[PDB]
Paper text:
Rapamycin and a structurally related immuno-suppressive natural product FK-506 (tacrolimus) 2(16,17) bind to a family of FK binding proteins (FKBP), which catalyze cis–trans isomerization of proline amide bonds found in peptides.
Due to the prevalence of a seco-product when bi-steric inhibitors containing a C32 carbonyl were dosed to rodents or when subjected to mildly basic conditions, we sought to prepare additional compounds that would be less susceptible to forming a ring-opened degradant. To test if modifying the C32 carbonyl of rapamycin was a viable direction, we reduced the carbonyl to a hydroxyl group to give compound 11(81−83) and also formed the C32 methyl ether to give compound 12.54 We then measured the affinity of rapamycin 1 together with compounds 11 and 12 for [name] and affinity for [name]-[name]. Despite these differences in [name] Kd binding, modified rapamycin cores 11 and 12 were potent in a [name]-[name] TR-FRET assay (EC50 < 10 nM), all being measured at the assay detection limit (entries 2 and 3); however, differences in the affinity were observed through pS6K inhibition.
Residue numbers in the entry:
A (entry chain B): 2018 to 2112
B (entry chain A): 1 to 108
Write the structure that this text describes.
Amino acid sequence: GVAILWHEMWHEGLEEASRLYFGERNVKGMFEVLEPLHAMMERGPQTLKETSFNQAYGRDLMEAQEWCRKYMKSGNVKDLTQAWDLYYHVFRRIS
Amino acid sequence: SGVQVETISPGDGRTFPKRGQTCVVHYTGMLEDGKKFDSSRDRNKPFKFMLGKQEVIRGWEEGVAQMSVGQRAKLTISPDYAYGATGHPGIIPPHATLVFDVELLKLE
Ligand SMILES: CO[C@H]1C[C@@H]2CC[C@@H](C)[C@@](O)(O2)C(=O)C(=O)N2CCCC[C@H]2C(=O)O[C@H]([C@H](C)C[C@@H]2CC[C@@H](O)[C@H](OC)C2)C[C@@H](OC)[C@H](C)/C=C(\C)[C@@H](O)[C@@H](OC)C(=O)[C@H](C)C[C@H](C)/C=C/C=C/C=C/1C
């Protein structure tokens, strides 16, 4: 039960992030789990299973980061919810 | 405290959402005064969630459970059952009475 593959990592990663932000109001803590996962996408896929994940969900996840960057500049929490609407879409399809 | 439910349109009666099943709904959340903060009807896509696993707030956890399939209703949720003293920053302030219109379309 250790997350090697990207869909496994993104599943428990978003579950941890969502618990921190919505459950406990921890915005900084929510980014600390998100930002490393997004950074591994930006490095790029190695395996076939990583590439097929990036084809399916990579555009949605990169858009969710762009909304997260818009929250950092603006400060309006409405931008942060738009990211979490995209994060929920990718979570259910993995689930 | 609590969650006062008031029906808009009636359900089938017999079919209820058990533990394990994924409640597919349409909803509209609005504040105590009237102003609207979130709505799935405006997005034109329904919202799915697994009941019984503490996924949603306490008003939904008891309020949606008592509803039958194909039933529209107005759930006036108290701040005890809602987000409460902390609230949800920049959307729901401290000690808010949340009015939730909701329609349980499909049990799934
Ligand atoms: C941008 O979209 C937001 C929702 C916005 C966020 C802002 C809100 C004002 C509101 O606009 O919805 C709103 O209208 C509202 O008030 N809603 C929504 C509909 C039902 C009632 C109520 C409403 O209960 O929502 C809930 C509260 C926020 C947190 C809950 C309250 C109960 C409490 O025990 C719980 O503690 C952990 C936090 C948000 C839920 O979303 C349904 C989502 C799906 C659930 C969670 C964050 C957690 O459970 C989580 O755990 C680890 C999970 O298991 C899920 C399955 C993991 C997954 C990765 C999370 C994805 C995030 C999705 C975010 C979405 C869809």
